[PDB]
Design an enzyme around this catalytic site. Structure first.
Site, PDB file in Angstrom:
ATOM      1  N   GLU A  71      -5.978 -10.468  -1.883  1.00 30.59           N
ATOM      2  CA  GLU A  71      -6.863 -10.263  -0.727  1.00 30.59           C
ATOM      3  C   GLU A  71      -8.325 -10.149  -1.146  1.00 30.59           C
ATOM      4  O   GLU A  71      -9.051  -9.296  -0.653  1.00 30.59           O
ATOM      5  CB  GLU A  71      -6.439  -9.022   0.074  1.00 30.59           C
ATOM      6  CG  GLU A  71      -4.908  -8.925   0.398  1.00 30.59           C
ATOM      7  CD  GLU A  71      -4.538  -7.777   1.334  1.00 30.59           C
ATOM      8  OE1 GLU A  71      -5.445  -7.188   1.989  1.00 30.59           O
ATOM      9  OE2 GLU A  71      -3.304  -7.479   1.437  1.00 30.59           O
TER      10      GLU A  71
ATOM     11  N   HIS B 189     -10.054  -5.828  -2.894  1.00 26.28           N
ATOM     12  CA  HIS B 189     -11.154  -5.564  -1.956  1.00 26.28           C
ATOM     13  C   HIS B 189     -12.216  -4.813  -2.757  1.00 26.28           C
ATOM     14  O   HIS B 189     -12.127  -3.584  -2.963  1.00 26.28           O
ATOM     15  CB  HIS B 189     -10.674  -4.760  -0.746  1.00 26.28           C
ATOM     16  CG  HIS B 189      -9.734  -5.522   0.133  1.00 26.28           C
ATOM     17  ND1 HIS B 189     -10.111  -6.670   0.796  1.00 26.28           N
ATOM     18  CD2 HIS B 189      -8.432  -5.312   0.446  1.00 26.28           C
ATOM     19  CE1 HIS B 189      -9.083  -7.130   1.492  1.00 26.28           C
ATOM     20  NE2 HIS B 189      -8.046  -6.335   1.282  1.00 26.28           N
TER      21      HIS B 189
ATOM     22  N   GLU C 251       0.816  -1.240   0.000  1.00 22.96           N
ATOM     23  CA  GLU C 251       0.000   0.000   0.000  1.00 22.96           C
ATOM     24  C   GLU C 251       0.849   1.291   0.000  1.00 22.96           C
ATOM     25  O   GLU C 251       0.587   2.226   0.777  1.00 22.96           O
ATOM     26  CB  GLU C 251      -0.961  -0.016   1.186  1.00 22.96           C
ATOM     27  CG  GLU C 251      -1.950  -1.191   1.122  1.00 22.96           C
ATOM     28  CD  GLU C 251      -2.927  -1.271   2.300  1.00 22.96           C
ATOM     29  OE1 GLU C 251      -2.991  -0.330   3.144  1.00 22.96           O
ATOM     30  OE2 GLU C 251      -3.626  -2.338   2.377  1.00 22.96           O
TER      31      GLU C 251
ATOM     32  N   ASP D 267     -12.059 -10.037  -1.583  1.00 24.09           N
ATOM     33  CA  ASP D 267     -13.391 -10.168  -0.954  1.00 24.09           C
ATOM     34  C   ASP D 267     -14.315  -9.178  -1.684  1.00 24.09           C
ATOM     35  O   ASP D 267     -13.830  -8.224  -2.309  1.00 24.09           O
ATOM     36  CB  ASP D 267     -13.398 -10.012   0.594  1.00 24.09           C
ATOM     37  CG  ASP D 267     -12.640  -8.775   1.114  1.00 24.09           C
ATOM     38  OD1 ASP D 267     -12.569  -7.707   0.436  1.00 24.09           O
ATOM     39  OD2 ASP D 267     -12.132  -8.863   2.267  1.00 24.09           O
TER      40      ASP D 267
HETATM   41  O1  LIG Z   1      -4.605  -4.506  16.614  1.00 28.50           O
HETATM   42  C1  LIG Z   1      -4.603  -5.435  15.526  1.00 28.50           C
HETATM   43  C2  LIG Z   1      -5.768  -5.071  14.595  1.00 28.50           C
HETATM   44  O2  LIG Z   1      -5.450  -3.838  13.917  1.00 28.50           O
HETATM   45  C3  LIG Z   1      -6.047  -6.191  13.576  1.00 28.50           C
HETATM   46  S1  LIG Z   1      -7.613  -5.837  12.675  1.00 28.50           S
HETATM   47  C4  LIG Z   1      -6.966  -6.237  11.017  1.00 28.50           C
HETATM   48  C5  LIG Z   1      -6.802  -4.959  10.166  1.00 28.50           C
HETATM   49  O3  LIG Z   1      -6.180  -5.368   8.916  1.00 28.50           O
HETATM   50  C6  LIG Z   1      -7.124  -6.218   8.261  1.00 28.50           C
HETATM   51  S2  LIG Z   1      -6.436  -6.566   6.651  1.00 28.50           S
HETATM   52  C7  LIG Z   1      -7.039  -5.121   5.691  1.00 28.50           C
HETATM   53  C8  LIG Z   1      -7.310  -5.574   4.257  1.00 28.50           C
HETATM   54  O4  LIG Z   1      -7.728  -4.470   3.393  1.00 28.50           O
HETATM   55  C9  LIG Z   1      -6.642  -3.534   3.242  1.00 28.50           C
HETATM   56  S3  LIG Z   1      -6.976  -2.212   2.009  1.00 28.50           S
HETATM   57  C10 LIG Z   1      -8.378  -1.308   2.756  1.00 28.50           C
HETATM   58  C11 LIG Z   1      -9.519  -1.406   1.744  1.00 28.50           C
HETATM   59  O5  LIG Z   1     -10.567  -0.481   2.053  1.00 28.50           O
HETATM   60  C12 LIG Z   1      -9.962   0.814   1.930  1.00 28.50           C
HETATM   61  S4  LIG Z   1     -11.282   1.928   1.381  1.00 28.50           S
HETATM   62  C13 LIG Z   1     -11.294   1.475  -0.392  1.00 28.50           C
HETATM   63  C14 LIG Z   1     -11.770   2.703  -1.195  1.00 28.50           C
HETATM   64  O6  LIG Z   1     -12.318   2.448  -2.517  1.00 28.50           O
HETATM   65  C15 LIG Z   1     -13.271   1.336  -2.537  1.00 28.50           C
HETATM   66  O7  LIG Z   1     -13.961   1.213  -3.798  1.00 28.50           O
HETATM   67  C16 LIG Z   1     -12.450   0.092  -2.166  1.00 28.50           C
HETATM   68  O8  LIG Z   1     -13.160  -1.119  -2.450  1.00 28.50           O
HETATM   69  C17 LIG Z   1     -12.137   0.197  -0.673  1.00 28.50           C
HETATM   70  O9  LIG Z   1     -11.498  -1.012  -0.228  1.00 28.50           O
HETATM   71  C18 LIG Z   1      -9.269   1.004   3.271  1.00 28.50           C
HETATM   72  O10 LIG Z   1      -8.945   2.378   3.512  1.00 28.50           O
HETATM   73  C19 LIG Z   1      -8.011   0.146   3.160  1.00 28.50           C
HETATM   74  O11 LIG Z   1      -7.302   0.178   4.393  1.00 28.50           O
HETATM   75  C20 LIG Z   1      -6.484  -2.882   4.607  1.00 28.50           C
HETATM   76  O12 LIG Z   1      -5.549  -1.818   4.495  1.00 28.50           O
HETATM   77  C21 LIG Z   1      -6.082  -3.902   5.695  1.00 28.50           C
HETATM   78  O13 LIG Z   1      -6.097  -3.216   6.958  1.00 28.50           O
HETATM   79  C22 LIG Z   1      -7.213  -7.581   8.936  1.00 28.50           C
HETATM   80  O14 LIG Z   1      -8.026  -8.476   8.170  1.00 28.50           O
HETATM   81  C23 LIG Z   1      -7.823  -7.305  10.299  1.00 28.50           C
HETATM   82  O15 LIG Z   1      -7.861  -8.502  11.050  1.00 28.50           O
HETATM   83  O16 LIG Z   1      -6.114  -7.528  14.186  1.00 28.50           O
HETATM   84  C24 LIG Z   1      -4.927  -7.898  14.929  1.00 28.50           C
HETATM   85  C25 LIG Z   1      -4.710  -6.880  16.063  1.00 28.50           C
HETATM   86  O17 LIG Z   1      -3.522  -7.224  16.783  1.00 28.50           O
END
Ligand SMILES: O[C@@H]1[C@@H](O)[C@H](S[C@@H]2CO[C@@H](S[C@@H]3CO[C@@H](S[C@@H]4CO[C@@H](S[C@@H]5CO[C@@H](O)[C@H](O)[C@H]5O)[C@H](O)[C@H]4O)[C@H](O)[C@H]3O)[C@H](O)[C@H]2O)OC[C@H]1O
Length: 314
Positions: free
Chosen positions: A233, A205, A127, A235
Site C-alpha cells: 500500500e 504508508h 493490521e 504512498d
Molecule cells: O465507508 C467507506 C469508507 O470508510 C471508505 S474510506 C477508505 C478507508 O480505507 C482507506 S485504505 C487505508 C490505508 O492505510 C491503512 S493503515 C493507516 C495508516 O495511518 C495510520 S497512522 C500511522 C502512524 O505512524 C506513521 O508514521 C505512519 O506513517 C502512519 O500511517 C492509521 O491509523 C492507519 O489506519 C488504513 O488502515 C486504511 O484505512 C481507503 O483508501 C479509503 O478509501 O470508502 C468506502 C466507503 O464505503
C-alpha cells in the site's frame, strides 16, 4: 521501458495499484491503470463492508468488477482483505463468542470461494498488531476471539482456496521494531507449525523524508522464514502543497522503497495505494497532508515516476 509496467515486467516483479472500480468510467484513470501496472488490488471493493453488508448476504458486484478488470487487462489480482477490524459492519460487531467466530469463518469461506481461481493472493488478516508491540487493542476480532483468530482465519482461507497465496498484512512494520518483531514471531510460529501462510505484506504508508533505513534487512529476515514478501500500500505523504524540495525527497523515497524490494529475491513487488493524488485517502485522514502518490491531481507524472522506473532497473 516506456512505462512502470514495462520496468517491473523486466525486473521480474509486480507493480500494482489500488483500484476504485467506479473510476474506470474516467478514461484518463483507466488509461493509466491499463498501461502502467501489471497487478491490481481493490481499494475497498473486497472489504467486509463492501461484500457482506448483512449476515450471510453478499454483494459481489463491485469486487467482481475489479476481478473482471484484472482478467480483461491481463493483470495479477491481489485480494484485500478477508479479516480486518476496520470497515466491519455493525451486524458483525453485534455478534459475540461462537456466533462471531462463525460469522468470521463464513465471511472468509464465502469471499475466498467466490474469487477462487481469480484472486492469486489474499490479505487474509490485516493490521493485527499494535504500534509498540503485541496485538491490536481496538479490534473486534482480538477482543471477541483472542489470539487464535489469526490461525483460524488462515486455516479457513486455505480450506476454501487450496492454492491462493495467503498473506498477513500490516503497517508501521517496515523497519525492525516492536511491531514488526511481534509480526515476525507469529510468522515464524505459523511456519514452524505448518499453519497455512505464504506471504507478508508491508503497507508502507510512509511520510516524505522518513523511509526506514533497515527496510531491506527487515524484508530479508521475513523472506528467510520461508515466505514471500510484498510492499502492498505504498504512498509517501507530505505537507501540501508540494514544492520542488518535497517532490525531490519523495522521489528519492520511492526509489529507496523499490530498491529495498529489488534487493530481496522473494520480494514479489510493490503496490501503490492509488494512481492520482486526486483520489488518495491521505487528505481525509491527515489534515494538510497529501500529494502522496506517483501522479498529481491533474494526472501529471511526478518526479517519483522516474525514481520508480530507475529503481526497477529500467
Ligand atoms: O465507508 C467507506 C469508507 O470508510 C471508505 S474510506 C477508505 C478507508 O480505507 C482507506 S485504505 C487505508 C490505508 O492505510 C491503512 S493503515 C493507516 C495508516 O495511518 C495510520 S497512522 C500511522 C502512524 O505512524 C506513521 O508514521 C505512519 O506513517 C502512519 O500511517 C492509521 O491509523 C492507519 O489506519 C488504513 O488502515 C486504511 O484505512 C481507503 O483508501 C479509503 O478509501 O470508502 C468506502 C466507503 O464505503
Amino acid at each position: 521501458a516506456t512505462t512502470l509496467k514495462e520496468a517491473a515486467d523486466g525486473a521480474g516483479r509486480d507493480f500494482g495499484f489500488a483500484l476504485d472500480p467506479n473510476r474506470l468510467s474516467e478514461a484518463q484513470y483507466k488509461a493509466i491503470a491499463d498501461s502502467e501496472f501489471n497487478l491490481v488490488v481493490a481499494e475497498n471493493a473486497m472489504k467486509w463492508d463492501a461484500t457482506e453488508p448483512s449476515q450471510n448476504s453478499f454483494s459481489f458486484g463491485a469486487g467482481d468488477r475489479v476481478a473482471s478488470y484484472a482478467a480483461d487487462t491481463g493483470k495479477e489480482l491481489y485480494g484485500h482483505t478477508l479479516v480486518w477490524h476496520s470497515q466491519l459492519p455493525d451486524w458483525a460487531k453485534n455478534l459475540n463468542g461462537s456466533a462471531f467466530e462463525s460469522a468470521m469463518v463464513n465471511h472468509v469461506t464465502k469471499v475466498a470461494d467466490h474469487f477462487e481461481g481469480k484472486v492469486a493472493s489474499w490479505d487474509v488478516v490485516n493490521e493485527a498488531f499494535a504500534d509498540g508491540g503485541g496485538r491490536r487493542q481496538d479490534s473486534a476480532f482480538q477482543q471477541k476471539l483472542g489470539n487464535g483468530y489469526i490461525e483460524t482465519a488462515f486455516r479457513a482461507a486455505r480450506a476454501a482456496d487450496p492454492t491462493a497465496k495467503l498473506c498477513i498484512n500490516d503497517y508501521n512494520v517496515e523497519g525492525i521494531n516492536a511491531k514488526s518483531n511481534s509480526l515476525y514471531d507469529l510468522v515464524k510460529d505459523f511456519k514452524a507449525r505448518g499453519v497455512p501462510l505464504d506471504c507478508v505484506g508491508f503497507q508502507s504508508h510512509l511520510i516524505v523524508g522518513q523511509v526506514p533505513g533497515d527496510f531491506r534487512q527487515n524484508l530479508q529476515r521475513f523472506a528467510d522464514l520461508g515466505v514471500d514478501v510484498r510492499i502492498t500500500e505504498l504512498d509517501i505523504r507530505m505537507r501540501t502543497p508540494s514544492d520542488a524540495t518535497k517532490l525531490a525527497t519523495q522521489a528519492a523515497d520511492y526509489k529507496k522503497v523499490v530498491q529495498a524490494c529489488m534487493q530481496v529475491t522473494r520480494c514479489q513487488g510493490v503496490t501503490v495505494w492509488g494512481i492520482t493524488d486526486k483520489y488518495s485517502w491521505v487528505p481525509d485522514v491527515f489534515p494538510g497532508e497529501g500529494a502522496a502518490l506517483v501522479w498529481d491531481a491533474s494526472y501529471a507524472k511526478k518526479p517519483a515516476y522516474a525514481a520508480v522506473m530507475e529503481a526497477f532497473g529500467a
